[PDB]
Design a protein around this ligand. Structure first.
Ligand code: CLA
Ligand code: CLA
Ligand code: CLA
Ligand code: CLA
Ligand code: CLA
Ligand code: CLA
Ligand code: CLA
Ligand code: CLA
Ligand SMILES: CC1=CCCC(C)(C)[C@H]1/C=C/C(C)=C/C=C/C(C)=C/C=C/C=C(C)/C=C/C=C(C)/C=C/C1=C(C)CCCC1(C)C
Ligand SMILES: CC1=CCCC(C)(C)[C@H]1/C=C/C(C)=C/C=C/C(C)=C/C=C/C=C(C)/C=C/C=C(C)/C=C/C1=C(C)CCCC1(C)C
Ligand SMILES: CC1=CCCC(C)(C)[C@H]1/C=C/C(C)=C/C=C/C(C)=C/C=C/C=C(C)/C=C/C=C(C)/C=C\C1=C(C)CCCC1(C)C
Lengths: 137, 451, 49, 503, 150, 93
């Protein structure tokens, strides 16, 4: 099947609103994800802390829930622990910590939007590959 | 056509350069043109790296191999090994590229229109391969030149800007090496150290004082030896122990250069002082110890007592004892317990990793460095898919250490093969049976039968 | 192991063989060498033994 | 002199001595047949034919006796299971002794032909040299082959003056030696129709007989005589090896895939009966029509014969043994004693789980209990931590129906797991592992061993056919090439290769 | 791990884990002795897998390399239950440290100890052997800082 | 151990056995993984969930989270083979 709009529609906000990503947006999101965070987050996993992956189950059960574009984009600038009680900006790539993480310095709001779109688009592409790990390679 | 065909020389086109052995001027042109090739590649490649360099990523993640050398020499890099300016790299590139034009003109001149043999028009430069004194004078001149190069590195490290010390107090930084170690027991203590684990021979340089002081020693040695060879002739023990032909000299240079290739490959693989991990990326030992460090910090943060945690086999999951008793990171990093890097020494006491520092005083920057070096291990494919062989195609990355080590190990083995070929041929041609066995006087038929 | 001794020589005893055995071999080789015609030659190798 | 690999070439041009060596080889083969029969009878256990048949005991050569009539023993037992009251001479023992006696007589004939070799029968009247009129000898032998084929088809297999042949039902439950009427028509070419054997052996034999009358009467054309080197016996050797490996491949195929000439109760089932669930489907339809008759699971499964349940078991598969796991099939899993019945797996609620069966390819297969539609429901985990489909979590009970363990409802998790491991291998049985000291690794049936041996022999005899065809067609250049080769082999010297009249 | 006369190898986990030592006084000095019992965990944990992929917390629950042995409906592989059933068993030991030197300036003390425990059981397959260790001890006594989080 | 009847409560079911469950299982229950689970596993052996709430030293917000997820939590007999691997069992992804 084509990259239809049904695949390209991803949740935007916590209420339930959706947004249809453009092909340029998903292309840029894939490139930015592979360049800025693929080293640890290849395949929707976390190499440094595999307890917390990027699969939709983990993002949905995060506090705040990270299964939407606004929540993901806020995480890319105000990262926190899985329960949302401690700031981990000094240990996580964030646009507010780009001097110590020189890959986040060039990202704009649209870049963060595209990266979140890539993250939310992936699980629709595969039933278990995104965040599945070795078992589904 | 004379001197350039099989009929008048006995060498085919594919052994074409073998027709240059006794043609001194044309051979000089060959050498100078090839040196022009070398400097051309240096300038062109470092300009290519400057053009493809993006200021976001570090050098080791971008596939850059040459700009790390200039950064180590102390150009355009600030504290923490952050490349702040890349204009000196451009200057070095353009200088090499422009000098390549001069060297190429000289080589093409001497190859095509220059005198064929220098032994009648320029007796000072002309030579015979069998004239030991003149060849030794040439060798001594080149030794003096090499000593001048070593002293150029010394001058750069001591006076002109200084070099990048990754072990510097605070973070790694460009600093003047004011007090190199000139003690013979240290410099030649490195040379006589073993190559095995923990010793490392000359790959185990852990400070720039030893490096600069031993480069002073190399400069003094080379200049003294060059003046020795200019004013001396080979002794009788040497005169009977070598084949005095051009191919023999080539084979000697080939074996030496092959050994250097192997040593340089292991320098790039294991050393992280002359090849700082912030320019060339983590070593394999560094990446493994970084994985162990990251998961130690994670599990300690989650309530585990890492010192008392038991792995599956009874050994430490995070911390154990080395075979000599030092407290070391556990798991399969136990083999890499000889790693010493500026980001992990801070937690190291006399008896190994200090448990108090490991428990209470691991800084966030150490965790960041460990995560970065874990995710950027030397593992990768020929098509540059970073990670283990069973990884997926999302990360495009092979460490510069892997490239340099593999390339120079390859070339070292290849040049050992070249040495074997050329040394055997030199011996056979000197003895005079490099073309075949004489049907008239076959040595085997004169030999008494065995058994 | 991993201590960095020059040539692995941790005991001073190890040097006695390491220096003397080459010296006895050198002494035996010198009797051969002194018997040779040690003048220079213009050839790829010496055919005189 | 004559190197070790050419030693049997001295008898190449000595027809009497050739007959002698052929006689000695025939004597050795007949003696092997007799001795193998005697050893098998010594080690055979005729007590239990349904759970310890011939093919479970490693009986290689006895099924070939039982295939075409010899189903009885002088000891008062039969492979069919019945007790013989008055066995005839032609039992297993009588066949073995007859083969030994024939071996001795053939040995004596070999001795006579070796000593008395210079007979006028072997000398050409025209030239006086020793020779063999191979095209006419072939016609005589083809007459003999046709007569024997027709006699076997018309008298032995049809039982007009013979026992008949082994015939069995679709599932190897009721099989016996009986006559088969010839199946003339297309049905005779069904490989699983035993009647097609008779139709073959009659008709083919007749044609063979007619062919003999041709070859004795009609001399070869000169063109084929010079092309095939009919005056060279090594032509006959090459062609015979060719036909022999052809037959070996065909027999290997009919053995592995099965046919009417390889009954399962004589050689065990095939791998494909296990792969397609051939016996599982039959057992299922039997119990289904029993249930439709008003019976319950216990009664329905009790009506399934033990032999049919024994066929539905992976250990009987020929594709489970090993190259160096040697001996009877009983030396592996053991001697089957009884059938414990069908283990229905009632989950915690009551849904029927089923353990996925081991494919023959896998030495070790995970124990997973798929649902009716087949979504995985329960399994035996490798990693117990974070286990979703453990039998403990889901909850399973094993209710046995049929067999000796009938009407028993185990509902603990351990005992459920133990019988899940058994149900992975098909039907569950009890085994004696002490009589033969069995080591618990599966072996191959006689079907698999026949297939292995004859496949390898067929390939090696293809090599032999290549070698001897090469020799007979290149006899003139055996010792090496002469000087004539240098002129013809030049490029463009002759318009036609080899021929020198051209240019 | 150690090797005995005859060439038999005994692995053991020399440990004082979960020790409950009792001082022989209200003040540590030369002649004071600290002693008590401790619980030694298993040499191998549950995650350890034997050469045939069998463990406590994971692994096969059968001898997979003998499917014909598991084919039997009567007993199956019940004979190999002792080797297949991996059991994490925590053993007991005792230690008696005797302090022969003590310092009040640094809080440091040193002396000798004798400890008794049991060796590796291979998850219950082996029978444990008693191990008697003797040696030297160092230690220090300080004031609780409140950040130890014991 | 070819039999361990408390496997379902090791992280694969809706109920979690606190005494011998890995930290990773608390990722299933929102708001408990990094902070609450650390204190759950610190004083791991509990007679029951009530003794866990009394003994765990939880702050008021942590107690509120635990009140939310009480029916998902239990405390069975501690298993040494599983307690030793309660923070890192080698199960990563
Ligand atoms: C590093 C590479 C290298 C170098 C430096 C040389 C150099 C040389 N080779 Mg060559 N050679 C090489 C590789 C190389 N070779 C290889 C790979 C092969 C195998 C095919 C050969 C096969 C070979 C044979 C068979 C022979 C030589 C010979 C020679 C010598 C004489 C050339 C001559 O008169 O040709 C004349 C060539 C030409 C007129 C063609 C034009 C070539 C132009 C000058 C190249 C342009 C270069 C550059 C763009 C100019 C820049 C100018 C500057 C001002 C900017 C010369 C010293 C000859 C020799 O030994 O003579 C005694 C000889 O017979 N070579
Ligand atoms: C391996 C290098 C090499 C060698 C051994 C030779 C050898 C020779 N060349 Mg030369 N040549 C070379 C490279 C080389 N060349 C190059 C690179 C070029 C291209 C520019 C030329 C171009 C060239 C030409 C065009 C001619 C020769 C000729 C000659 C011959 C005479 C040299 C002479 O009179 O010197 C005299 C020396 C000088 C004039 C140099 C003076 C020094 C100046 C001022 C530079 C100072 C540099 C400074 C010290 C460096 C500081 C270093 C610091 C950065 C650390 C001789 C056989 C001649 C020949 O064969 O005629 C038939 C000839 O006509 N060569
Ligand atoms: C490019 C470098 C170079 C080259 C090609 C030569 C070539 C020569 N030198 Mg030497 N020489 C050089 C540099 C060089 N020298 C320098 C810089 C010095 C110091 C001043 C000397 C001092 C010197 C003297 C005093 C003499 C020579 C002599 C000789 C001749 C004999 C060489 C021999 O048999 O060595 C034999 C080598 C050995 C027996 C072993 C070397 C000992 C070192 C310390 C080994 C240490 C171990 C090492 C680290 C192991 C690992 C190495 C690894 C790379 C494989 C020959 C013409 C002889 C001659 O006839 O002069 C007129 C002579 O007597 N040279
Ligand atoms: C395709 C050919 C090829 C290419 C492209 C390269 C490329 C490279 N090699 Mg080389 N190499 C090759 C073939 C090749 N090699 C072969 C066949 C061998 C033999 C086996 C080697 C053996 C070899 C070794 C032994 C080493 C390299 C290394 C290198 C790297 C650095 C080059 C350098 O600076 O050298 C050195 C350059 C020179 C000798 C030229 C003169 C340098 C002067 C004296 C420096 C002056 C410095 C001073 C501070 C300047 C300022 C002065 C003043 C203002 C104060 C580079 C990636 C190095 C590396 O990183 O290895 C891991 C290294 O150590 N190579
Ligand atoms: C310092 C470097 C050096 C120098 C100056 C020379 C010089 C010479 N070599 Mg060479 N040689 C070298 C390194 C060197 N060699 C090495 C490292 C090897 C080992 C691989 C060889 C192997 C070698 C052989 C086998 C022969 C020579 C010969 C010669 C002479 C003629 C070569 C020619 O005209 O080629 C012209 C160039 C070409 C035809 C281009 C060929 C390009 C090839 C096909 C590409 C590489 C293929 C493959 C990847 C190599 C794998 C190598 C393996 C060990 C890993 C000349 C004196 C020949 C001779 O007559 O000696 C007296 C000769 O027979 N050399
Ligand atoms: C109406 C009379 C009649 C009837 C009913 C039959 C019935 C039969 N004939 Mg036929 N037959 C008859 C007359 C009759 N024949 C006559 C008059 C002749 C002439 C003498 C023959 C000659 C004849 C031959 C030569 C063969 C049969 C065979 C058969 C059987 C076919 C079914 C079967 O099992 O095939 C199974 C066998 C096949 C389907 C033949 C396979 C042929 C392929 C091409 C072989 C390929 C081999 C090759 C080397 C492999 C390379 C690759 C590999 C290594 C991977 C069956 C019993 C076949 C047989 O004996 O089967 C056991 C057989 O081969 N018949
Ligand atoms: C192709 C013909 C054939 C076939 C299919 C079978 C089939 C069978 N025979 Mg065998 N058997 C045959 C010929 C055949 N036999 C012959 C000619 C003899 C007389 C020697 C025997 C004697 C015999 C006996 C005594 C017994 C069997 C038994 C069996 C059964 C088990 C087979 C086994 O374990 O193999 C195991 C085979 C191997 C371990 C080796 C196979 C792999 C290759 C061929 C090895 C080649 C090695 C090579 C020559 C190099 C050796 C080097 C040397 C220096 C050591 C099986 C039904 C057993 C049975 O159940 O009887 C009731 C039994 O006890 N057979
Ligand atoms: C029935 C078929 C048959 C017949 C009649 C012959 C006959 C002959 N072959 Mg043989 N050959 C055959 C099949 C046959 N071959 C096959 C299938 C192959 C392929 C492997 C060969 C390959 C072959 C070669 C390559 C050569 C011969 C040669 C010969 C001649 C001399 C052999 C000799 O003296 O060996 C003497 C043999 C020995 C002293 C010991 C052999 C021991 C063997 C290897 C192992 C044990 C065998 C075992 C006891 C019985 C096998 C059972 C059977 C069911 C396979 C002779 C005319 C030779 C020839 O042409 O000479 C002019 C020759 O060089 N043959
Ligand atoms: C000034 C500036 C600003 C921005 C960047 C920019 C790059 C544009 C830069 C410009 C740089 C420029 C224009 C650099 C010029 C460099 C030039 C022309 C270099 C040329 C070097 C010449 C070389 C090697 C010659 C070597 C030739 C050889 C062995 C020939 C070999 C051969 C010979 C001798 C005989 C037989 C045949 C064979 C084998 C081919
Ligand atoms: C080595 C090898 C390679 C490949 C196959 C295999 C792995 C199986 C293995 C074995 C191969 C082979 C070819 C084995 C074959 C064995 C053979 C041919 C054994 C021979 C058995 C023959 C016997 C007893 C004959 C008995 C004869 C007797 C009393 C005769 C006596 C008599 C005589 C002589 C005169 C008349 C009266 C009377 C009493 C009948
Ligand atoms: C520069 C630098 C950087 C980092 C810190 C460090 C301290 C290492 C510092 C100093 C480094 C130093 C001082 C390095 C010096 C290296 C040395 C002296 C290496 C020695 C190499 C010598 C070699 C192969 C000798 C081999 C000679 C041979 C077979 C001669 C020939 C022969 C002989 C002897 C007998 C048999 C026949 C044959 C084959 C003709």
């Amino acid at each position: 099947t084509d990259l239809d709009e049904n695949t390209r529609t991803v949740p935007l906000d916590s209420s339930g609103t959706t947004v249809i990503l453009t092909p340029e947006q998903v292309k840029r999101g894939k490139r930015l994800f592979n360049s800025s965070c693929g080293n640890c987050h290849v395949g929707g996993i976390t190499k440094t802390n595999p307890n917390l992956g990027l699969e939709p189950d983990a993002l949905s059960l995060a506090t705040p829930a990270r299964d939407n574009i606004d929540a993901l984009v806020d995480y890319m600038k105000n990262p926190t622990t899985y329960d949302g009680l401690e700031s981990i900006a000094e240990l996580h790539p964030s646009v507010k910590s780009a001097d110590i993480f020189p890959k986040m310095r060039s990202l704009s709001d649209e870049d963060l939007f595209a990266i979140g779109g890539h993250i939310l688009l992936q699980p629709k592409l595969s039933s278990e590959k995104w965040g599945g790990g070795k078992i589904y390679y | 056509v004379a001197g350039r065909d099989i009929e008048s020389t006995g060498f085919a086109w594919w052994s074409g350069n073998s027709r240059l052995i006794n043609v001194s001027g044309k051979l000089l042109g060959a050498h100078v043109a090839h040196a022009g090739l070398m400097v051309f590649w240096c300038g062109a490649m470092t300009l290519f790296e400057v053009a493809h360099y993006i200021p976001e990523k570090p050098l080791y993640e971008q596939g850059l191999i040459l700009l790390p050398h200039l950064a180590v020499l102390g150009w355009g890099v600030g504290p923490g090994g952050e490349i702040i300016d890349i204009y000196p790299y451009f200057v070095v590139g353009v200088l090499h590229l422009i000098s390549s034009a001069v060297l190429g003109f000289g080589g093409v001149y001497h190859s095509l229109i220059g005198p064929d043999t220098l032994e009648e028009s320029f007796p000072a430069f002309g030579y015979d391969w069998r004239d030991k004194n003149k060849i030794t004078t040439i060798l001594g001149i080149h030794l003096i030149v090499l000593g001048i190069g070593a002293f150029l590195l010394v001058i750069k490290a001591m006076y002109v800007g200084g070099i990048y010390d990754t072990w510097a107090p605070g973070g790694g930084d460009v600093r003047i090496i004011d007090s190199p170690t000139l003690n013979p027991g240290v410099i030649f203590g490195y040379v006589l150290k073993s190559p095995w684990g923990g010793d490392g021979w000359i790959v185990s340089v852990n400070n720039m004082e030893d490096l600069v002081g031993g480069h002073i020693w190399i400069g003094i040695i080379c200049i003294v030896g060059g003046f020795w060879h200019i004013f001396t002739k080979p002794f009788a023990w040497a005169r009977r122990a070598y084949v005095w032909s051009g191919e023999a000299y080539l084979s000697y240079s080939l074996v030496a250069v092959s050994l250097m290739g192997f040593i340089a490959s292991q320098y790039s693989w294991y050393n992280n002082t002359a090849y700082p991990s912030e320019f060339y990326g983590p070593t394999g030992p560094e990446a493994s110890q970084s994985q162990a460090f990251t998961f130690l910090v994670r599990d300690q943060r989650l309530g585990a007592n890492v010192s008392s945690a038991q792995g599956p086999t009874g050994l430490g999951k995070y911390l154990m004892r080395s075979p000599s008793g030092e407290i070391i990171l556990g798991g399969e990093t136990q083999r890499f317990w000889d790693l010493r890097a500026p980001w992990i020494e801070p937690l190291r006491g006399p008896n190994g990793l200090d448990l108090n520092k490991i428990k209470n005083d691991i800084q966030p920057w150490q965790e960041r460095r460990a995560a970065e070096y874990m995710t950027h291990a030397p593992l990768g494919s020929l098509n540059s898919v970073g990670g283990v062989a069973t990884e997926i195609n999302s990360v495009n990355y092979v460490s510069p250490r892997s490239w340099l080590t593999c390339a120079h190990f390859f070339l070292g083995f290849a040049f050992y093969i070249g040495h074997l070929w050329h040394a055997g041929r030199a011996r056979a041609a000197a003895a005079g049976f490099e073309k075949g066995i004489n049907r008239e006087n076959e040595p085997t038929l004169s030999l008494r039968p065995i058994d | 192991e991993g201590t960095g001794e020059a040539l692995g020589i941790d005991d001073t005893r190890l040097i006695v063989p390491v220096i003397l055995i080459p010296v006895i071999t050198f002494i035996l080789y010198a009797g051969f060498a002194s018997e040779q015609d040690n003048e220079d030659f213009f050839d790829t190798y010496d055919q005189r033994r | 002199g004559l190197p070790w690999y050419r030693v049997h070439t001295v008898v190449l041009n000595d027809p009497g001595r050739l007959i002698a060596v052929h006689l000695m080889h025939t004597a050795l083969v007949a003696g092997w047949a007799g001795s193998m029969a005697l050893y098998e009878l010594a080690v055979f256990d005729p007590s239990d034919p349904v759970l310890n048949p011939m093919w479970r005991q490693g009986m290689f050569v006895m099924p070939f006796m039982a295939r075409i009539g010899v189903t009885d023993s002088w000891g008062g037992w039969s492979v069919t299971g019945e007790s013989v009251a008055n066995p005839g001479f032609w039992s297993f023992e009588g066949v073995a002794l007859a083969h030994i006696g024939l071996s001795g007589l053939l040995f004596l004939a070999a001795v006579w032909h070796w000593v008395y070799w210079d007979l006028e029968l072997f000398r050409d009247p025209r030239t006086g040299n020793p020779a063999l009129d191979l095209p006419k000898i072939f016609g005589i032998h083809l007459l003999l082959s046709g007569v024997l084929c027709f006699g076997f088809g018309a008298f032995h297999v049809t039982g007009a003056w013979g026992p008949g042949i082994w015939v069995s039902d679709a599932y190897g439950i009721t099989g016996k030696v009986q006559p088969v009427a010839p199946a003339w028509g297309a049905e005779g070419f069904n490989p699983f129709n035993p009647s097609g054997v008779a139709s073959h052996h009659i008709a083919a034999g007749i044609l063979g007989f007619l062919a003999g009358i041709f070859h004795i009467a009609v001399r070869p054309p000169q063109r084929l005589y010079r092309a095939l080197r009919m005056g060279n016996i090594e032509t006959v050797l090459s062609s015979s090896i060719a036909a022999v490996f052809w037959s070996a491949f065909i027999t290997t195929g009919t053995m592995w895939y099965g046919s009417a000439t390889t009954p399962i109760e004589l050689f065990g089932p095939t791998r494909y009966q296990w792969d397609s669930g051939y016996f599982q489907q039959e057992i299922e339809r039997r119990v289904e029509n029993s249930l439709n008759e008003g019976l319950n699971l216990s009664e329905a499964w009790s009506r399934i014969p033990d032999k049919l349940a024994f066929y539905d078991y992976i250990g009987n598969n020929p594709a489970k043994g090993g190259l160096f796991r040697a001996g009877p099939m009983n030396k592996g899993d053991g001697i089957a004693e009884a059938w414990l019945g069908h283990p229905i797996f009632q989950d915690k609620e009551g849904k029927e789980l089923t353990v996925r069966r081991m494919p023959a390819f896998f030495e070790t297969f995970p124990v997973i209990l798929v649902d009716k539609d087949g979504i995985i429901r329960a399994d035996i985990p490798f990693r117990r931590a974070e286990s979703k489909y453990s039998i403990e979590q889901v909850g399973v009970t094993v209710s046995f129906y049929g067999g000796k363990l009938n009407g028993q409802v185990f509902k603990d998790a351990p005992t459920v797991k133990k019988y899940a491991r058994k149900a992975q291998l098909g039907e569950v049985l009890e085994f004696d592992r002490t009589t033969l000291e069995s080591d618990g690794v599966f072996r191959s049936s006689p079907r698999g061993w026949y297939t292995f041996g004859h496949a390898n022999f067929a390939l090696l005899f293809f090599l032999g056919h290549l070698w001897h065809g090469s020799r007979t067609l290149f006899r003139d250049v055996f010792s090496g090439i002469g000087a004539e080769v240098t002129e013809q082999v030049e490029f463009g010297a002759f318009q036609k290769l080899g021929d020198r009249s051209t240019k | 791990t150690v090797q005995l006369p005859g060439g038999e190898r005994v692995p053991f986990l020399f440990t004082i884990k979960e020790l409950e030592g009792k001082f022989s006084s209200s003040q540590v000095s030369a002649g004071t002795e600290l002693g008590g019992n401790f619980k030694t965990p298993s040499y191998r944990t549950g995650l350890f897998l034997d050469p045939k992929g069998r463990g406590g917390t994971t692994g096969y629950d059968m001898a997979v390399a003998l499917p014909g042995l598991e084919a039997d409906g009567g007993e199956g592989q019940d004979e190999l239950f002792a080797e297949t059933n991996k059991v994490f068993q925590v053993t007991d030991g005792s230690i008696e440290m005797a302090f022969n030197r003590v310092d009040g300036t640094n809080g440091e003390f040193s002396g000798v100890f004798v400890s008794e425990q049991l060796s590796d059981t291979d998850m219950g397959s082996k029978a444990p052997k008693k191990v008697l260790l003797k040696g030297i001890v160092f230690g220090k006594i300080e004031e609780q800082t409140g950040d130890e989080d014991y | 151990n070819v039999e361990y009847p408390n496997v379902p409560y090791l992280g694969g079911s809706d109920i979690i056995d606190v005494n011998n469950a890995n930290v990773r299982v608390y990722t299933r229950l929102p708001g408990m993984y990094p902070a609450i689970a650390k204190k759950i596993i610190k004083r791991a052996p509990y007679k029951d969930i009530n003794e866990m709430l009394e003994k765990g030293d939880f702050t008021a917000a942590e107690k509120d989270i635990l009140d939310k997820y009480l029916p998902n939590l239990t405390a069975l007999e501690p298993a040494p083979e599983y307690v030793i691997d309660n923070i890192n069992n080698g199960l990563y992804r």
